[PDB]
């Protein structure tokens, strides 16, 4: 495309903690509980997008697919590339160990 591309790049080079959520979805609700619950708001940058009706959802999903390859929200990505998905905070959470992983990427302290 590359006139989605190419400005999809520039995103993640200032923003590359970015969080592509719903705006009412049961998953988008998910990744904002722990979120919110976690008071970690500033040092990550999450965008709902739930507005953008079908004709623009298309467009993203696209770009979205071109940069990591998830034509499904939410997702999580770090330093510019697919570091966390939907199912990985479950998985990590049932585990108990989301809390040693999320220190790792140099999030918490």
């Known amino acids: 495309m590359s ?6 790049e520039e995103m993640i080079k200032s ?3 970015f969080q592509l959520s719903a705006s009412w979805c049961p998953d988008c609700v998910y ?5 919110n619950k976690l008071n970690v708001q500033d040092k990550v ?3 709902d997008i739930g507005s953008l009706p079908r004709n623009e959802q298309e467009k993203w999903r696209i770009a979205f697919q ?5 034509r499904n929200l939410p997702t999580i990505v770090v330093n510019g590339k697919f570091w966390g998905t939907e199912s990985q905070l479950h998985r990590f959470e ?12 140099g999030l918490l302290p």
């Open 94 to 105: 049932a585990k108990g160990t989301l809390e040693e992983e999320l220190t790792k990427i």
């Open 15 to 17: 923003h590359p903690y």
């Open 66 to 70: 071109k940069v990591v390859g998830s």
């Open 31 to 35: 990744a904002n509980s722990i979120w």
């Open 45 to 47: 940058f999450v965008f």
């Open 3 to 8: 006139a989605f591309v190419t400005k999809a």
